[PDB]
Amino acid sequence: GKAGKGTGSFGKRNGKTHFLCLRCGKRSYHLQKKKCASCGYPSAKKRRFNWSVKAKRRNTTGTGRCRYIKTLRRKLKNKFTEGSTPKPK
Amino acid sequence: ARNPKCPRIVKSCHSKTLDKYGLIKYPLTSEKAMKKIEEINTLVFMCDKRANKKNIKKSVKNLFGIECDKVNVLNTLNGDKKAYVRLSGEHDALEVANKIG
Amino acid sequence: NVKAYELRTLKKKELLDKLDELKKELSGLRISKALGNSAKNSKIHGVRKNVARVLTVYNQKRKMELRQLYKNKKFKPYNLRKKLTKNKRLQLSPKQKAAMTLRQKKKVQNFPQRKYLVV
Amino acid sequence: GSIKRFRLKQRLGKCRRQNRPVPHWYRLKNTKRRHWRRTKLGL
RNA sequence: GAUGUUAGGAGGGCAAAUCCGCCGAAUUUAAGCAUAUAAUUAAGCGGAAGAAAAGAAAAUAACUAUGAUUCCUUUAGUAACGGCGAGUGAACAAGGACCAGCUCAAACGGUUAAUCCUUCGUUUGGUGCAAACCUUUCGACGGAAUUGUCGUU
RNA sequence: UAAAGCUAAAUAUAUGUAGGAGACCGAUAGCAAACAAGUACCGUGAGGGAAAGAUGAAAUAGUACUCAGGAAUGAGCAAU
RNA sequence: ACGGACCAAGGAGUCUAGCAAAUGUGCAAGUGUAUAUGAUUCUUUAAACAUUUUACGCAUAAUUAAUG
RNA sequence: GAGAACUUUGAAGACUGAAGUGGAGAAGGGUUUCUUGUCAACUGUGAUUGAACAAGAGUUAGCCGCUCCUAAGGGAUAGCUGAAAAGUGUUUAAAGGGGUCCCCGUCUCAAAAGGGAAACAGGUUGAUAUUCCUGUGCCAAUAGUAUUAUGAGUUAGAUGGUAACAUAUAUAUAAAUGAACUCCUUUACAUAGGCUUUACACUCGGGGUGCGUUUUCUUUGCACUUUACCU
RNA sequence: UUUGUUUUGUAGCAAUAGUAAUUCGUAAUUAUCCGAAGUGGUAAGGACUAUCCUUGAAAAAAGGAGGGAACGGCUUUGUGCUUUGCUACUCUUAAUACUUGUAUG
RNA sequence: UUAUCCAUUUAUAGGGAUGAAUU
Ligand SMILES: [Mg+2]
Ligand SMILES: [Mg+2]
Ligand SMILES: [Mg+2]
Ligand SMILES: [Mg+2]
Ligand SMILES: [Mg+2]
Ligand SMILES: [Mg+2]
Ligand SMILES: [Mg+2]
Ligand SMILES: [Mg+2]
Ligand SMILES: [Mg+2]
Ligand SMILES: [Mg+2]
Ligand SMILES: [Mg+2]
Ligand SMILES: [Mg+2]
Ligand SMILES: [Mg+2]
Ligand SMILES: [Mg+2]
Ligand SMILES: [Mg+2]
Ligand SMILES: [Mg+2]
Ligand SMILES: [Mg+2]
Ligand SMILES: [Mg+2]
Ligand SMILES: [Mg+2]
Ligand SMILES: [Mg+2]
Ligand SMILES: [Mg+2]
Ligand SMILES: [Mg+2]
Ligand SMILES: [Mg+2]
Ligand SMILES: [Mg+2]
Ligand SMILES: [Mg+2]
Ligand SMILES: [Mg+2]
Ligand SMILES: [Mg+2]
Ligand SMILES: [Mg+2]
Ligand SMILES: [Mg+2]
Ligand SMILES: [Mg+2]
Ligand SMILES: [Mg+2]
Ligand SMILES: [Mg+2]
Ligand SMILES: [Mg+2]
Ligand SMILES: [Mg+2]
Ligand SMILES: [Mg+2]
Ligand SMILES: [Mg+2]
Ligand SMILES: [Mg+2]
Ligand SMILES: [Zn+2]
């Protein structure tokens, strides 16, 4: 058998089992299953595990600009009332 | 039927949705485009990825005295749209090209 | 190269007109850039900035008018509402928190935590 | 193949853009280069 | 009881170190191993806060009695549990840190819900350049409430 | 005085941000990461996961010029 | 018999808990000021000092299943 | 060109031999395509070559697909389970459409080889072509009112044909009353065997063109003689 | 309206396009494009025949039929309905004009 | 039999004596 378990078999390897995945962008969206291996896309959750500490660290809050959270930070310190500018001149 | 005492959100800001300026980004030169301009009275424009054929036509109408017979479009692999715009027989693409600059 | 303080006085229509002109100018610049040119390639940035400024001014004006329109009247559009952390919003007003039962209030009135210098 | 999803096409374009080398003038004021034949995008 | 893109609202997700529930092992130790041990641990799932939880005695004591919780020092490696093997293992007192109490239900008030809320308002103030807040008392029109709100202890 | 409830303080923090520290580590150490590091790259995937700091005081001194070279480079009576 | 091509760097009885004897030191029928308080203590000060104008540990007594 | 066994051109000699290192596509790849450069490394020899490096440039559709339908199936709605996470999918549901109140009715995803509105020919680029251009078509839409023309029917709904059935040829066969509610049919179907018909392909004979052989022989050998959808 | 004869047409598309020529010029003209048939290699269709304890998808969409609901227009009067008078009407394509969001991809 | 459980359909007439079929 030319299609043996090694090299012969690697030749028949065509067709993604996982695609890119809306939400995570990590090619872990199992097409056939319609579920992300990394996020659990359809399930309204992120799918993260305390047994995968490295994984957790590589995906936590601080990774990725924090668009709004960052902006909010320091506001507490300022304690400025909402909707107020500083005095002109 | 809805009867809201106050509207949830009121984006009083000037519309973000792309107008003619921003829809149509710039004319394309390039030997191909030049050829098109010469031989077939078709003007080539780089345009917003999210512009529709109708929209592009409208923009063209607004931006220049041009009338368009047909507009073919494609998405470039630089993340921009290329619109091939064939002008009606009443107009001379070359003259309009000149006008545009 | 128009700056903010000159634009605050101008009517909204005029501002809009200005903005359109600026946009047109920008378009021209872009076109020039696209063609084999490098003459006014650095002028465009300034124009863009100006446009942005104009937009900001107009937006502010719009906001102000909106605010004026929706003065008081209990409920307000969520944008005009005092945007604050969700938790804070949820949280009871200080007054509400304070509000004690009548008996408790009476008690408080009667025997407050007095100062009693001990010598 | 020769029939891609729009998103995929966009991604490809982005990758291509990334590929191009440092504009030389900066050097006077890359390690992430890629080759289509040696490192796959795994899209 | 359904139903409504009715009017006004709320929940969902992310983040966990401390925190609170659940759910839940095994490696391991016993020179084997099965009870035990690991461990009421890890993982799993759910939920909070700047702390959480606990908390105002159906408490301990047997004293000349102490007096909500929590935490520290201690009791104490003690009582006890444990193929009484390996191992495990508190509590009361005592010294502190800090100290804070309370309100529902039930009893009573019918010469009368004395309550409460939505919406629309009305007019004195105080700040701020504005934006806004901050308070003040006063009635409407609705409802909720007698299957029980509020006052009294 | 059970079978209803609330309640600050002391107490805990290996998470996040912001400060301040060390009889700590000194680029095979210290976080995996002093550097475009959770980056490149590998794995279908869950995941795994690096290497890589230092010219000089000053490149606003980064090698001018000449000769030999196809060029790289080399050499100089030349040069910072 | 096994390990070792070579070189450079890294590379292995440590740290804590309680017990022990050894020895040093202080005090000694006592000893250790535990938490915690107090200060004219505050770069060092997370230490040093102080201990309220019969706390507890171990020891001073043993023994018994035990009331004792 | 500094430099050539492996760059290019010509001339030989050869192979691949229509089950092809030829054309097209799918999966996968992702700018590898193309032009101008071009050689630090790579291109296991060289290399001036390159799928390398650099700068640009390139992918145009109502008709080709996806887009719509359902299939094996999947994700969910109601429930019901379960501490939850999840596991099930009418098991005791008040589960949007069609007609003028009745009559139906889980939703949604799942085929770039199943089903399916409609496109062909020539030409053109450095690189795209059923997609651009020229030409010819086809399909689906096309609100209301008012004019117009086009023809029907009536003076409320044609005719022929014994019958099988046929008939509107107006620029264009447009028009042959029809609601509710039904019943069909198309979609829509295995494999094998031969037989037939068409099509392309190949060939043969002749005429017509050009080329090839010619010491000798050959009315000769080869090439071209084409015709698309649509009506 | 039917019969006889002739000339056309690669049935329109269509020759203006191709292909093979021949020239002339620095793109244009010209001439060619057609008379017979066989092989059955492909592909499709047709009518059939055989095999099965195997009988060989569904729906979207479309069509046909049964069925017979409803029924011209305008004007006037009374409370969509009824009565009275008059005769171009009901269709249907295509075109056009006008409002309504800008009514072809 | 009312709890419960099972089945049946559009939850379609209370029990006995090879056309069409609807407003
Ligand atoms: Mg295997
Ligand atoms: Mg699969
Ligand atoms: Mg397109
Ligand atoms: Mg693909
Ligand atoms: Mg490869
Ligand atoms: Mg949550
Ligand atoms: Mg359990
Ligand atoms: Mg063991
Ligand atoms: Mg052992
Ligand atoms: Mg856990
Ligand atoms: Mg929280
Ligand atoms: Mg609490
Ligand atoms: Mg304790
Ligand atoms: Mg002890
Ligand atoms: Mg235990
Ligand atoms: Mg509590
Ligand atoms: Mg390191
Ligand atoms: Mg050995
Ligand atoms: Mg050896
Ligand atoms: Mg070794
Ligand atoms: Mg060493
Ligand atoms: Mg000693
Ligand atoms: Mg080679
Ligand atoms: Mg051969
Ligand atoms: Mg051979
Ligand atoms: Mg080839
Ligand atoms: Mg190439
Ligand atoms: Mg080589
Ligand atoms: Mg090249
Ligand atoms: Mg490249
Ligand atoms: Mg099609
Ligand atoms: Mg559907
Ligand atoms: Mg199915
Ligand atoms: Mg499921
Ligand atoms: Mg689908
Ligand atoms: Mg198909
Ligand atoms: Mg011709
Ligand atoms: Zn994901």
mmCIF file of N, CA, C and O (backbone and C1' of nucleotides) in Angstrom, chain B residues 28-33 36 40 42 53 70-74 77 82 84 86, chain H residues 30-31 56-62 124-129 131-134:
data_model
loop_
_atom_site.group_PDB
_atom_site.id
_atom_site.type_symbol
_atom_site.label_atom_id
_atom_site.label_comp_id
_atom_site.label_asym_id
_atom_site.label_seq_id
_atom_site.Cartn_x
_atom_site.Cartn_y
_atom_site.Cartn_z
ATOM 1 N N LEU B 28 -7.184 55.960 -10.884
ATOM 2 C CA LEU B 28 -6.018 55.127 -11.109
ATOM 3 C C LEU B 28 -5.388 55.498 -12.431
ATOM 4 O O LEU B 28 -6.075 55.641 -13.442
ATOM 5 N N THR B 29 -4.074 55.671 -12.408
ATOM 6 C CA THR B 29 -3.290 55.706 -13.634
ATOM 7 C C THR B 29 -3.000 54.258 -14.008
ATOM 8 O O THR B 29 -3.925 53.453 -14.095
ATOM 9 N N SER B 30 -1.725 53.922 -14.162
ATOM 10 C CA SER B 30 -1.300 52.597 -14.598
ATOM 11 C C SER B 30 -1.575 52.452 -16.079
ATOM 12 O O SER B 30 -2.595 52.937 -16.600
ATOM 13 N N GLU B 31 -0.621 51.802 -16.740
ATOM 14 C CA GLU B 31 -0.629 51.605 -18.179
ATOM 15 C C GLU B 31 -1.950 51.034 -18.637
ATOM 16 O O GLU B 31 -2.490 51.479 -19.670
ATOM 17 N N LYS B 32 -2.471 50.078 -17.872
ATOM 18 C CA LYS B 32 -3.734 49.411 -18.179
ATOM 19 C C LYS B 32 -4.854 50.455 -18.196
ATOM 20 O O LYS B 32 -5.694 50.536 -19.122
ATOM 21 N N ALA B 33 -4.885 51.207 -17.099
ATOM 22 C CA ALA B 33 -5.935 52.204 -16.923
ATOM 23 C C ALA B 33 -5.859 53.266 -18.003
ATOM 24 O O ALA B 33 -6.905 53.653 -18.541
ATOM 25 N N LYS B 36 -7.260 51.897 -21.161
ATOM 26 C CA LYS B 36 -8.719 51.858 -21.020
ATOM 27 C C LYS B 36 -9.313 53.225 -21.349
ATOM 28 O O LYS B 36 -10.295 53.338 -22.111
ATOM 29 N N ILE B 40 -11.336 52.756 -24.814
ATOM 30 C CA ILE B 40 -12.700 52.302 -24.544
ATOM 31 C C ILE B 40 -13.570 53.223 -23.705
ATOM 32 O O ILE B 40 -14.651 52.814 -23.279
ATOM 33 N N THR B 42 -13.349 54.317 -20.631
ATOM 34 C CA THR B 42 -13.583 53.757 -19.303
ATOM 35 C C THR B 42 -12.604 54.371 -18.310
ATOM 36 O O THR B 42 -11.398 54.340 -18.537
ATOM 37 N N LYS B 53 -22.231 49.307 -6.487
ATOM 38 C CA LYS B 53 -22.148 49.797 -7.865
ATOM 39 C C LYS B 53 -22.961 51.073 -8.040
ATOM 40 O O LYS B 53 -22.483 52.053 -8.625
ATOM 41 N N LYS B 70 -22.138 51.773 -17.611
ATOM 42 C CA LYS B 70 -21.991 50.536 -16.860
ATOM 43 C C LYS B 70 -20.777 50.636 -15.951
ATOM 44 O O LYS B 70 -19.778 51.239 -16.333
ATOM 45 N N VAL B 71 -20.863 50.056 -14.755
ATOM 46 C CA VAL B 71 -19.727 50.047 -13.845
ATOM 47 C C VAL B 71 -19.392 48.626 -13.407
ATOM 48 O O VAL B 71 -20.199 47.944 -12.790
ATOM 49 N N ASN B 72 -18.200 48.175 -13.759
ATOM 50 C CA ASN B 72 -17.703 46.906 -13.257
ATOM 51 C C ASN B 72 -16.756 47.164 -12.093
ATOM 52 O O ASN B 72 -15.981 48.119 -12.126
ATOM 53 N N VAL B 73 -16.821 46.324 -11.062
ATOM 54 C CA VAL B 73 -15.996 46.521 -9.869
ATOM 55 C C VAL B 73 -15.291 45.241 -9.438
ATOM 56 O O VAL B 73 -15.760 44.136 -9.693
ATOM 57 N N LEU B 74 -14.154 45.405 -8.775
ATOM 58 C CA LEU B 74 -13.422 44.283 -8.192
ATOM 59 C C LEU B 74 -12.704 44.690 -6.903
ATOM 60 O O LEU B 74 -12.330 45.858 -6.731
ATOM 61 N N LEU B 77 -6.312 43.095 -3.987
ATOM 62 C CA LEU B 77 -5.658 42.434 -2.870
ATOM 63 C C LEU B 77 -4.830 43.406 -2.015
ATOM 64 O O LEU B 77 -3.911 42.998 -1.309
ATOM 65 N N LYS B 82 -11.427 48.494 -7.063
ATOM 66 C CA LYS B 82 -11.158 49.082 -8.376
ATOM 67 C C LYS B 82 -12.471 49.088 -9.145
ATOM 68 O O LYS B 82 -13.108 48.043 -9.279
ATOM 69 N N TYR B 84 -14.214 49.858 -12.724
ATOM 70 C CA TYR B 84 -14.079 50.177 -14.135
ATOM 71 C C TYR B 84 -15.375 50.844 -14.549
ATOM 72 O O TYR B 84 -16.432 50.216 -14.502
ATOM 73 N N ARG B 86 -17.519 52.596 -17.422
ATOM 74 C CA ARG B 86 -17.700 52.917 -18.841
ATOM 75 C C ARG B 86 -18.648 54.102 -19.007
ATOM 76 O O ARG B 86 -19.795 54.044 -18.583
ATOM 77 P P G H 30 -0.468 29.711 2.374
ATOM 78 O "O5'" G H 30 -0.432 30.994 1.433
ATOM 79 C "C5'" G H 30 0.680 31.210 0.547
ATOM 80 C "C4'" G H 30 0.275 32.128 -0.577
ATOM 81 C "C3'" G H 30 -0.057 33.561 -0.159
ATOM 82 O "O3'" G H 30 0.687 34.487 -0.942
ATOM 83 C "C1'" G H 30 -1.748 32.693 -1.565
ATOM 84 P P U H 31 1.379 35.749 -0.245
ATOM 85 O "O5'" U H 31 2.038 36.519 -1.474
ATOM 86 C "C5'" U H 31 2.941 35.845 -2.366
ATOM 87 C "C4'" U H 31 2.522 36.062 -3.801
ATOM 88 C "C3'" U H 31 2.748 37.468 -4.365
ATOM 89 O "O3'" U H 31 3.493 37.431 -5.582
ATOM 90 C "C1'" U H 31 0.580 36.691 -4.900
ATOM 91 P P G H 56 6.577 50.494 -4.593
ATOM 92 O "O5'" G H 56 5.452 50.937 -5.632
ATOM 93 C "C5'" G H 56 4.672 49.961 -6.349
ATOM 94 C "C4'" G H 56 4.789 50.186 -7.838
ATOM 95 C "C3'" G H 56 3.622 49.663 -8.667
ATOM 96 O "O3'" G H 56 2.645 50.682 -8.855
ATOM 97 C "C1'" G H 56 5.628 48.697 -9.453
ATOM 98 P P A H 57 1.109 50.395 -8.495
ATOM 99 O "O5'" A H 57 0.652 49.393 -9.646
ATOM 100 C "C5'" A H 57 0.677 49.804 -11.026
ATOM 101 C "C4'" A H 57 0.625 48.604 -11.942
ATOM 102 C "C3'" A H 57 -0.610 47.720 -11.825
ATOM 103 O "O3'" A H 57 -1.709 48.265 -12.549
ATOM 104 C "C1'" A H 57 1.332 46.369 -11.952
ATOM 105 P P G H 58 -3.209 48.009 -12.045
ATOM 106 O "O5'" G H 58 -3.435 46.461 -12.348
ATOM 107 C "C5'" G H 58 -3.490 45.971 -13.702
ATOM 108 C "C4'" G H 58 -3.412 44.462 -13.729
ATOM 109 C "C3'" G H 58 -4.547 43.724 -13.041
ATOM 110 O "O3'" G H 58 -5.689 43.661 -13.885
ATOM 111 C "C1'" G H 58 -2.471 42.715 -12.488
ATOM 112 P P U H 59 -7.148 43.876 -13.270
ATOM 113 O "O5'" U H 59 -7.550 42.412 -12.790
ATOM 114 C "C5'" U H 59 -7.833 41.372 -13.745
ATOM 115 C "C4'" U H 59 -8.509 40.202 -13.068
ATOM 116 C "C3'" U H 59 -9.734 40.535 -12.217
ATOM 117 O "O3'" U H 59 -10.706 39.506 -12.365
ATOM 118 C "C1'" U H 59 -8.164 39.369 -10.911
ATOM 119 P P U H 60 -11.960 39.708 -13.333
ATOM 120 O "O5'" U H 60 -12.430 41.197 -13.016
ATOM 121 C "C5'" U H 60 -13.441 41.466 -12.027
ATOM 122 C "C4'" U H 60 -14.249 42.682 -12.419
ATOM 123 C "C3'" U H 60 -15.444 42.420 -13.329
ATOM 124 O "O3'" U H 60 -16.523 43.264 -12.945
ATOM 125 C "C1'" U H 60 -13.990 43.960 -14.367
ATOM 126 P P A H 61 -17.858 42.635 -12.334
ATOM 127 O "O5'" A H 61 -18.414 41.750 -13.535
ATOM 128 C "C5'" A H 61 -19.098 42.354 -14.650
ATOM 129 C "C4'" A H 61 -20.160 41.420 -15.180
ATOM 130 C "C3'" A H 61 -21.299 41.098 -14.209
ATOM 131 O "O3'" A H 61 -22.535 40.940 -14.903
ATOM 132 C "C1'" A H 61 -20.188 39.106 -14.800
ATOM 133 P P G H 62 -23.444 42.217 -15.253
ATOM 134 O "O5'" G H 62 -24.890 41.786 -14.741
ATOM 135 C "C5'" G H 62 -25.114 41.409 -13.368
ATOM 136 C "C4'" G H 62 -26.186 40.347 -13.283
ATOM 137 C "C3'" G H 62 -25.962 39.122 -14.159
ATOM 138 O "O3'" G H 62 -25.286 38.132 -13.394
ATOM 139 C "C1'" G H 62 -28.133 40.002 -14.547
ATOM 140 P P U H 124 -6.691 39.967 -31.815
ATOM 141 O "O5'" U H 124 -6.726 40.897 -30.521
ATOM 142 C "C5'" U H 124 -6.780 42.333 -30.634
ATOM 143 C "C4'" U H 124 -7.077 42.958 -29.292
ATOM 144 C "C3'" U H 124 -6.064 42.678 -28.194
ATOM 145 O "O3'" U H 124 -4.962 43.574 -28.277
ATOM 146 C "C1'" U H 124 -8.262 42.371 -27.355
ATOM 147 P P U H 125 -3.494 43.079 -27.872
ATOM 148 O "O5'" U H 125 -3.525 43.125 -26.280
ATOM 149 C "C5'" U H 125 -3.547 44.378 -25.570
ATOM 150 C "C4'" U H 125 -3.327 44.145 -24.094
ATOM 151 C "C3'" U H 125 -2.009 43.484 -23.720
ATOM 152 O "O3'" U H 125 -0.952 44.435 -23.640
ATOM 153 C "C1'" U H 125 -3.801 42.477 -22.522
ATOM 154 P P G H 126 0.459 44.131 -24.341
ATOM 155 O "O5'" G H 126 0.841 42.692 -23.771
ATOM 156 C "C5'" G H 126 2.189 42.189 -23.848
ATOM 157 C "C4'" G H 126 2.576 41.511 -22.552
ATOM 158 C "C3'" G H 126 1.420 40.973 -21.716
ATOM 159 O "O3'" G H 126 1.259 39.589 -22.014
ATOM 160 C "C1'" G H 126 2.823 42.372 -20.385
ATOM 161 P P A H 127 -0.204 38.947 -22.127
ATOM 162 O "O5'" A H 127 -0.656 38.815 -20.606
ATOM 163 C "C5'" A H 127 -0.244 37.689 -19.808
ATOM 164 C "C4'" A H 127 -0.532 37.938 -18.347
ATOM 165 C "C3'" A H 127 -2.001 38.120 -17.979
ATOM 166 O "O3'" A H 127 -2.664 36.869 -17.831
ATOM 167 C "C1'" A H 127 -0.688 39.785 -16.916
ATOM 168 P P U H 128 -4.079 36.626 -18.541
ATOM 169 O "O5'" U H 128 -5.067 37.551 -17.699
ATOM 170 C "C5'" U H 128 -5.364 37.264 -16.319
ATOM 171 C "C4'" U H 128 -6.792 37.645 -16.000
ATOM 172 C "C3'" U H 128 -7.857 36.881 -16.778
ATOM 173 O "O3'" U H 128 -8.295 35.749 -16.031
ATOM 174 C "C1'" U H 128 -8.210 39.228 -16.998
ATOM 175 P P A H 129 -8.690 34.383 -16.779
ATOM 176 O "O5'" A H 129 -8.911 34.839 -18.290
ATOM 177 C "C5'" A H 129 -9.978 34.295 -19.090
ATOM 178 C "C4'" A H 129 -11.147 35.250 -19.111
ATOM 179 C "C3'" A H 129 -12.265 34.914 -20.100
ATOM 180 O "O3'" A H 129 -13.347 34.257 -19.445
ATOM 181 C "C1'" A H 129 -11.797 37.278 -19.971
ATOM 182 P P U H 131 -17.596 37.356 -21.663
ATOM 183 O "O5'" U H 131 -18.450 38.490 -20.937
ATOM 184 C "C5'" U H 131 -18.939 38.319 -19.590
ATOM 185 C "C4'" U H 131 -18.145 39.155 -18.611
ATOM 186 C "C3'" U H 131 -16.896 39.837 -19.163
ATOM 187 O "O3'" U H 131 -17.097 41.059 -19.884
ATOM 188 C "C1'" U H 131 -16.546 38.949 -16.951
ATOM 189 P P C H 132 -18.051 42.239 -19.334
ATOM 190 O "O5'" C H 132 -17.262 43.557 -19.762
ATOM 191 C "C5'" C H 132 -16.229 44.117 -18.923
ATOM 192 C "C4'" C H 132 -15.128 44.749 -19.750
ATOM 193 C "C3'" C H 132 -15.476 45.092 -21.192
ATOM 194 O "O3'" C H 132 -15.971 46.427 -21.252
ATOM 195 C "C1'" C H 132 -13.447 43.852 -21.128
ATOM 196 P P C H 133 -17.197 46.798 -22.217
ATOM 197 O "O5'" C H 133 -16.563 46.676 -23.673
ATOM 198 C "C5'" C H 133 -15.627 47.657 -24.164
ATOM 199 C "C4'" C H 133 -15.295 47.393 -25.615
ATOM 200 C "C3'" C H 133 -16.482 47.094 -26.523
ATOM 201 O "O3'" C H 133 -16.984 48.299 -27.090
ATOM 202 C "C1'" C H 133 -14.825 45.419 -26.796
ATOM 203 P P U H 134 -18.518 48.400 -27.546
ATOM 204 O "O5'" U H 134 -18.560 47.521 -28.874
ATOM 205 C "C5'" U H 134 -17.841 47.922 -30.057
ATOM 206 C "C4'" U H 134 -17.966 46.867 -31.131
ATOM 207 C "C3'" U H 134 -19.361 46.303 -31.337
ATOM 208 O "O3'" U H 134 -20.197 47.160 -32.106
ATOM 209 C "C1'" U H 134 -17.813 44.524 -31.238
#
